[PDB]
C-alpha cells in the first residue's frame, strides 16, 4: 500500500452535447478505498462531482456526472454527459482510504476544454 | 471543531421557526450538513441534507414541502426553517456533518435544538 | 423506504459482560462489498456519538471494545466487556439509499 491513481487524458477536448470520458487508474484489489472525481472550483477548492461506488446520500448531487468501472477492475470512466460551455476546467481523482479514515491521494490535474 | 446550534423555542401551530448550525471553514470545506430530529420518547428521523459548496439539497419526501436549507458560507452557518408547525414537529432538531467525500458516518452532532409546538 | 429493525429493545447486563446487539435491514444495504450502514450511541439529555461506521470500522476515538460487524441485511454492534460508561442507548442508520433512516433503537441497562 498504495500509490495515488492516474488521471487520463491530460488534455481533453470537446464543445457541447458531446460526452466527455476521462480514464481514473487505481490498481487495487481494495482493501477498501473509494474513489473521488473532483473539479477545480473557482476557490481553488476540489468540489466532489462523483464517487465510486456511488454516494447516493450527497446531497445536490448531478447526475451529469457518472463513474463506471471497467472489466479489469482497476480502470473507471468518468465522464460528463451532454457536457456544456462552464464544465470547461480542471479535473482530477482521488482515492480515499476508509481504514485510516482520513486518507486520499489525489491524481495529476487534467484538462477539459 | 464545534457545531453550535441556537437556542430553544416555543411556537404556535401554523408558525414558523429557522434553527442555527454554526459551523467551520473547515467543516463547509469537507463536509455535508445533515438535519435529524427526535420527537420525545421516540428514535431518530432524517430530514434533509444539503452541501455547502453549491446549496444543492436533498430531503426526506415527508418534509420537503414544509423545510427550508440554507447555508452562509460568509459565517459558516447552517440554517433549518421548518413552516406551518404541526403539534408533533414537537421534536429536538439536530445538525450533524458527514465527510463529503464518502459517508463515513455523521461524525459530529450540535448539541440539538428543543421545539414545542402547541396551541 | 429501507426500514432498520433492531433487537432486543433492553438489554439487561452487568460491568465486564459482553453485550451483542442487531439490527436487521428489510433490503440489503450492502454494494460492492461496502455496507453503508453506522452506529451510534446516545445518552440521556445528549447528541449521538458515532461509533462504528461503514459496518466495521472503528470511528478515531472510540474505545477498541466497540466493534462492529455484518452485511446484506444482518448487523450487529458487540461490546467485548462493558464498562459503566457503556450503558446507553444505540441505533443504527443506513445510507444505502434515500431516505437515511434509524433503527428504533437498543437499551443496554445494568442488570441487578
Known amino acids: 500500500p498504495w500509490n495515488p491513481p492516474t488521471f487520463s487524458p491530460a488534455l481533453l477536448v470537446v464543445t457541447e452535447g458531446d460526452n466527455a470520458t476521462f480514464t481514473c487508474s487505481f490498481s487495487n484489489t481494495s482493501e477498501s478505498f473509494v474513489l473521488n472525481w473532483y473539479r477545480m472550483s473557482p476557490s481553488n477548492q476540489t468540489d466532489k462531482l462523483a464517487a465510486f461506488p456511488e454516494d447516493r446520500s450527497q446531497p445536490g448531487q448531478d447526475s451529469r456526472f457518472r463513474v463506471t468501472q471497467l472489466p479489469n477492475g482497476r480502470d473507471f470512466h468518468m465522464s460528463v454527459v451532454r457536457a456544456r460551455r462552464n464544465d470547461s476546467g480542471t479535473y482530477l481523482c482521488g482515492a480515499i482510504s476508509l481504514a485510516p479514515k482520513a486518507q486520499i491521494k489525489e491524481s495529476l490535474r487534467a484538462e477539459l476544454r | 471543531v464545534q457545531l453550535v446550534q441556537s437556542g430553544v423555542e416555543v411556537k404556535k401551530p401554523g408558525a414558523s421557526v429557522k434553527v442555527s448550525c454554526k459551523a467551520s471553514?473547515?467543516?463547509?470545506?469537507?463536509?455535508?450538513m445533515y438535519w435529524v430530529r427526535q420527537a420525545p420518547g421516540q428514535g431518530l428521523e432524517w430530514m434533509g441534507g444539503?452541501?455547502?459548496?453549491?446549496?444543492?439539497?436533498n430531503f426526506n419526501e415527508k418534509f420537503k414541502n414544509r423545510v427550508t436549507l440554507t447555508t452562509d458560507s460568509s459565517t459558516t452557518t447552517a440554517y433549518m426553517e421548518l413552516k406551518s408547525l404541526q403539534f408533533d414537529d414537537t421534536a429536538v432538531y439536530y445538525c450533524?456533518?458527514?465527510?463529503?467525500?464518502?459517508?463515513?458516518?455523521?461524525?459530529?452532532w450540535g448539541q440539538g435544538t428543543t421545539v414545542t409546538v402547541s396551541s | 423506504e429501507i426500514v432498520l429493525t433492531q433487537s432486543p429493545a433492553t438489554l439487561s447486563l452487568s460491568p465486564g459482560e459482553r453485550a451483542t446487539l442487531s439490527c436487521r435491514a428489510s433490503?440489503?444495504?450492502?454494494?460492492?462489498?461496502?455496507?453503508?450502514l453506522h452506529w451510534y450511541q446516545q445518552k440521556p439529555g445528549q447528541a449521538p456519538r458515532l461509533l462504528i461506521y461503514l459496518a466495521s470500522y472503528l470511528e478515531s476515538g472510540v474505545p477498541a471494545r466497540f466493534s462492529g460487524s455484518g452485511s446484506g441485511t444482518d448487523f450487529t454492534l458487540t461490546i467485548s466487556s462493558l464498562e459503566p460508561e457503556d450503558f446507553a442507548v444505540y441505533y443504527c442508520?443506513?445510507?444505502?439509499?434515500?431516505?437515511?433512516?434509524f433503527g428504533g433503537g437498543t437499551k443496554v441497562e445494568i442488570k441487578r
Open positions: 450533524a456533518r458527514r465527510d463529503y467525500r464518502f459517508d463515513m458516518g455523521f461524525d459530529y
Open positions: 444539503i452541501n455547502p459548496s453549491n446549496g444543492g439539497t
Open positions: 433490503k440489503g444495504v450492502s454494494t460492492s462489498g461496502y455496507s453503508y
Open positions: 442508520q443506513h445510507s444505502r439509499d434515500l431516505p437515511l433512516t
Open positions: 471553514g473547515y467543516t463547509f470545506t469537507n463536509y455535508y
